[PDB]
């Protein structure tokens, strides 16, 4: 039967913390899902262990939609990063099981392939503009068609995306950054030309009119996207940016629900939605987000940093392979130790991912190997202004 | 003055509660409610593993900076687990601040705006008649306001074994039955009594519009939680079609869950309580936004918010200009013993405490006598098996 016999979390730190849900059916078939929430990992682990897992036992594993609604509505307190990550982990494991039962790779189950490979972007970072440019050259040589560029801001010790369990404390100056950033993109274009796709992550630090100014300043450099311009709990925060610049906009890695972005999409305030499988309620929910996005010409650009496990990456590559309105897939390679803990069949070649062909999402976990790497607490940084004001990191 | 220690206490004197205690280098302490019904251990872990270590050494007096540090610093913002952890810290810090000031909490917030805090009681029964008996009984205790719920004939379970109980639901049967309850309450008890009703998420907007209109003759104090409101626009049809007052928000945790509801004048009462809404710091901002639009506070006050929340809420209720009403579900004697407090209930109303802080403490030795026991909230299915809203 497809009745659930067992379900449990695995916590491991093969270079960084990962939490994984495993679901095992009465017939012995199993599925896994990513439950990793960077810097708050044990909150999801406990949400799953104490409150979700006992309710999964005896459930029909084939009932994906019912389980999703049961956990989403049944929680009573709806949405949220801990909440939606727990739900995502269950959803991914159930889709893994369904695809295995169907004898198909996940992309086939979703509606089959819409493309022959999945374009990625790489992180190019450096202290100086020159340092970053060197990194762009290296990745272009590796075959990347797209690069995210970040560089230090002169007069500021720490800037995002440029180079102990408690939050590190960074210092920020918006005004210095606003004057410096356009110089980076100018230098990229001068050295590498127009065919390269160039991305930039603002990482929440601006107000809307400041982001509008930046967007206008970087129009000549034709960025693939300007990402996370402003905190967007208030979705209307995007409107001034959109009304003032034609630089394409990306947002959403911090979102967990379609209700965090319904308005952003329907009002045409963004070009790319960034919310990934692990944090956005899994395959079931993200299919719905991508479909809504498609009505408004919005494309997917999944958050793909290392704090999403190979389980998320494999499932995302399947999703990317099917989804009509695919935009790009972020690539941050995992460590060798992480890759070994999570055997998988997706492949990376010449700047692109290729989806696996084995039934399931194609990712597994080696539990005995995972057990060799105990959890190590690690928190994300905070950002303060020059006067000490607790700002957005 | 720095935080020297912070830790959670988990206890089950009749039901589960999670509490955060913060202690300073001068040996002063404060506590905050961290209870999230049916997901309690997620908050416990959020605090234990991720928040508590970052509190050590922080200036206890920096309430605002700490709130922002935890809220923005989490990176992943908002949510029930997140905002409850933040609320627990915030309540404990306000507790310490008031104690440092030598004042009960309401004094710190801006002083007294009213002499007492009106409550409502839960009145419930299988039949309308059963419910009416409960109303009579509560009116005799001095309640000026009652929430009324009764069973729907033809349906085994209506709103108002560690796993979710499974209830069955019929909207159509409820819609036809509910007006009869309010009619009976008015027929027996007259017009002076305030009468409330909790729809408990089960309707679509046009169904709630229909219900609102149908119950206009009974002049309800509020119709609560008509529809799931993740999509805040869900309230619009209800508001355009009825003048029955509307309340919502016990399942919210952020001002961003209700900013539009308030600004578009779609609701009359906001229900989000201190424990789940990010504590005093955040709820002051929510109540203040509400005030621009004639919206009043109606804090969720069920038993799954601890006496720590209740004491702090009574202080808040005593200060806030735009107070509407305070929900009252009495805690068990065992719960009251675990959480000694100085708020009082008299003649249908709360009276705020006068001792410095929010006036609530926790007896840790007694708390230890009641270990955690897993308990989940129910789910609701339609007659065809559809997983619905409970
Ligand atoms: O675009 C990105 O890749 C993200 O912004 C990351 O840099 C985040 O900071 C990290 O994933 C948080 O856990
Ligand atoms: O109005 C109320 O009192 C609430 O709706 C409660 O009945 C909730 O069901 C309970 O607090 C959930 O934890
Ligand atoms: Cl959450
Ligand atoms: Mg980013
Ligand atoms: Mg209610
Ligand atoms: Mg009209």
Swiss-Prot record, chain A:
Enzyme Commission number(s) from the entry: 4.2.1.-, 4.2.1.39, 4.2.1.8
Positions with a binding annotation for Mg(2+): 201, 227, 253
Site (Important for activity and substrate specificity): residue numbering on this chain: 305
Cofactor: record remark: Binds 1 Mg(2+) ion per subunit.
Catalytic machinery residues: 160 (proton donor/acceptor), 203 (proton donor/acceptor)
Cofactor dependency: Mg(2+)
Superkingdom of the organism of origin: Bacteria
Enzyme class: lyase
Keywords associated with the record: Lyase, Magnesium, Metal-binding
Catalytic activity as recorded in UniProt: D-mannonate = 2-dehydro-3-deoxy-D-gluconate + H2O; D-gluconate = 2-dehydro-3-deoxy-D-gluconate + H2O
SUPFAM superfamilies: Enolase C-terminal domain-like, Enolase N-terminal domain-like
Annotated InterPro entries: D-mannonate_dehydratase-like, D-mannonate_dehydratase_GalD, DgoD-like, Enolase-like_C_sf, Enolase-like_N, Enolase_C-like, Mandel_Rmase/mucon_lact_enz_CS, Mandelate_racemase_C
Pfam families the UniProt entry points to: MR_MLE_C, MR_MLE_N
Family assignment from sequence similarity: Belongs to the mandelate racemase/muconate lactonizing enzyme family. GalD subfamily.
Function of the protein: Has low dehydratase activity with D-mannonate and D-gluconate, suggesting that these are not physiological substrates and that it has no significant role in the in vivo degradation of these compounds. Has no detectable activity with a panel of 70 other acid sugars (in vitro).
Protein name: D-galactonate dehydratase family member ManD
């Amino acid at each position: 039967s497809l009745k659930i016999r067992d379900a449990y979390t695995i916590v491991t730190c093969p270079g960084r913390n990962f939490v994984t849900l495993k679901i095992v059916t009465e017939s012995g078939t199993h599925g896994i899902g990513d439950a990793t929430l960077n810097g708050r990992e044990m909150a999801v682990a406990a949400y799953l262990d104490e409150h979700v897992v006992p309710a999964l036992i005896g459930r029909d594993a084939g009932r994906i939609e019912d389980t999703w609604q049961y956990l989403y509505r049944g929680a009573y307190w709806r949405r949220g990063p801990v909440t939606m990550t727990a739900i995502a982990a269950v959803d991914m494991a159930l889709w893994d099981i369904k695809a295995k039962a169907a004898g198909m790779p996940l992309y086939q189950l979703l509606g089959g392939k819409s493309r022959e490979r999945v374009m990625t972007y790489a992180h190019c970072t450096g202290q100086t503009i020159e340092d970053c440019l060197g990194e762009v050259a290296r990745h272009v040589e590796l075959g990347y068609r797209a690069v995210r560029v970040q560089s230090g801001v002169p007069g500021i010790e720490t800037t995002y995306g440029v180079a102990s369990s408690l939050p590190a404390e960074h210092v920020w100056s918006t005004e210095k950054y606003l004057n410096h950033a356009p110089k980076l993109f100018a230098a990229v274009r001068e050295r590498f030309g127009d065919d390269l796709h160039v991305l930039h992550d603002v990482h929440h630090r601006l107000t809307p009119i400041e982001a509008a100014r930046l967007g206008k300043a970087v129009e000549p450099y034709h960025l693939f996207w300007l990402e996370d311009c402003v905190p967007a709990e208030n979705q209307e925060s995007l409107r001034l940016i959109r009304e003032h610049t034609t630089t394409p906009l990306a947002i959403g890695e911090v979102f967990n629900s379609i209700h965090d972005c319904r308005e952003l999409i329907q009002n045409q305030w963004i070009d790319y939605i960034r919310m990934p499988l692990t944090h956005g309620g899994g395959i079931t929910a993200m299919r719905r987000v991508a479909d809504l996005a498609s009505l408004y010409h919005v494309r997917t650009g999944f958050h793909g940093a290392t704090d999403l496990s190979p389980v998320c990456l494999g499932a995302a590559i399947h999703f990317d392979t099917w989804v009509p309105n695919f935009g790009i897939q972020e690539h941050m390679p995992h460590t060798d130790e992480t890759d070994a803990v999570f055997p998988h069949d997706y492949r990376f070649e010449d700047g692109h991912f290729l989806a696996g062909e084995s039934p399931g999402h194609g990712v597994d976990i080696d539990e005995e190997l995972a057990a060799k790497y105990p959890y190590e607490r690690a928190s994300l940084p905070v950002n303060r202004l020059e006067d000490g004001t607790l700002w957005h990191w």
